[PDB]
Structures are given as C-alpha cells and as structure tokens.
Design a protein around this ligand. Structure first.
Ligand SMILES: CC(=O)SCCNC(=O)CCNC(=O)[C@H](O)C(C)(C)COP(=O)(O)OP(=O)(O)OC[C@H]1O[C@@H](n2cnc3c(N)ncnc32)[C@H](O)[C@@H]1OP(=O)(O)O
Length: 174
C-alpha cells in the first residue's frame, strides 16, 4: 500500500467489523485495504468477483481479522448466518452457526503457519470450537488445513454451499 500500515494497525491482528472503526480519512485507508485484500483472495480462489470488500463489510454483520507483521499478510472473515441445515436424516433445521466466509494468506507466505495463527486467534475471541463452524465453499487447501490442525473431517453433505463437520450437531447455534 502507499500508507503507514503500522500506524493504522499497531497490533499484529486487527479485529474489524461493519464499522471499520480504526484501532477518519484513514477509515478510508481501512477501506482500500479491505478492498485490495478481498480482490487478492478472489484471485487466489479463482473467483470472477471478490466476496469481501469495504462496500460489503459495511452492508453486513461480518467480522474481519486482519493479520499484519513487523504489509498485510492476510485475513479471515466470519459471521453468523441463518442456515437451514440438512442433517443425517435428510431433515432441514434452522440454525445460526458462526461461519467462515473468506480466508486468505498471501501466496509468498502461505504454509508458514500464518493461517493457523489467524485461525486460533479468531477461535479464541469468538469462543467457539472448530466443529461448531459452517464453512462457505471450503477450498481444497482449507479442507486439508482444517483436517491437520483440528482433525475436521466432512459430515452430511449439504444442498446449500456450506460444509459442516462431524460434531456440528451438538450446539443450538444462536
Ligand atoms: C472459507 C473460505 O474462505 S475458502 C478458501 C480458503 N482460501 C484459499 O484457499 C486461498 C488460498 N489459501 C490460503 O490463503 C491458505 O492456504 C489458507 C488456505 C488461507 C491456509 O493458510 P496457511 O497460512 O497456508 O496455512 P498454514 O501454514 O497455517 O497451515 C498449513 C496447512 O494448511 C494446508 N495447506 C496450505 N497450503 C496448502 C497447499 N498448497 N496444498 C495443500 N495443503 C495446504 C495443509 O494442511 C498445511 O499443512 P501441511 O503443510 O502439514 O500439509
């Protein structure tokens, strides 16, 4: 970026929401960051359009955890979503689990443990176990990621594009 990232983000992991409320012509600096991060994740995921942007973060109830170091390394975006989830008895149930919506580590530093670092921090602040999560179209990398770090192995295939794991049916999800 053309800005003092460390001045804007003093902390290693910055937690932001619909209010890009800085840790205001730098609340616009936050925007440019979210906007570029989202496009980078799109290119990495072979998406024609980003699923993360400033315009959209403002229009939703999503939380982004931005990772920096001592230059933005990556991010993970989460949110609670009303999903009507298929169980093992072909029954659909309304739940509101915490969902992983976007997740990106810059290519140069992928597979250095930064994903886990960002993921553990999110799990701690959100106070959730990995098996309570629903994931929006997990990539092959994310599936191996989740299996190594948390022993997550896919359960009942959904008809929506979310994926849940063995253990999901244990919480009430509000
Ligand atoms: C819900 C969503 O947002 S879906 C899409 C998820 N995002 C993407 O696929 C974008 C590109 N990928 C990435 O940004 C990151 O790989 C994720 C996917 C963000 C992983 O972040 P990382 O920081 O690389 O992971 P970290 O080093 O913490 O963990 C490594 C583990 O993740 C998996 N992993 C990461 N990259 C790869 C790869 N190219 N091939 C296979 N497994 C991989 C493996 O389990 C690996 O463990 P191993 O090296 O012992 O096999």
């Amino acid at each position: 970026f053309p800005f003092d990232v460390d001045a804007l983000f003093p902390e290693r992991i910055t937690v932001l929401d619909q209010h890009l409320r800085p840790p205001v012509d730098l609340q616009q600096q936050i925007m440019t960051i979210i906007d570029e991060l989202g496009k980078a994740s799109a290119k990495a995921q072979n998406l024609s359009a980003p699923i993360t942007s400033a315009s959209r973060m403002q229009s939703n109830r999503h939380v982004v955890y931005i990772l920096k170091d001592s230059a933005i390394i990556g991010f993970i975006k989460v949110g609670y979503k009303k999903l009507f989830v298929l169980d093992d008895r072909e029954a659909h149930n309304e739940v509101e689990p915490l969902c992983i919506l976007d997740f990106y580590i810059h290519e140069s530093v992928q597979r250095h443990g930064h994903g886990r670092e960002l993921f553990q921090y999110m799990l701690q602040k959100e106070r959730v176990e990995p098996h309570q999560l629903a994931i929006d179209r997990p990539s092959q990398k994310l599936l191996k990621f989740l299996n190594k770090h948390y022993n997550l192995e896919t359960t009942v295939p959904q008809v929506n594009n979310f994926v849940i794991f063995e253990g999901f049916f244990a919480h009430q999800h509000r």
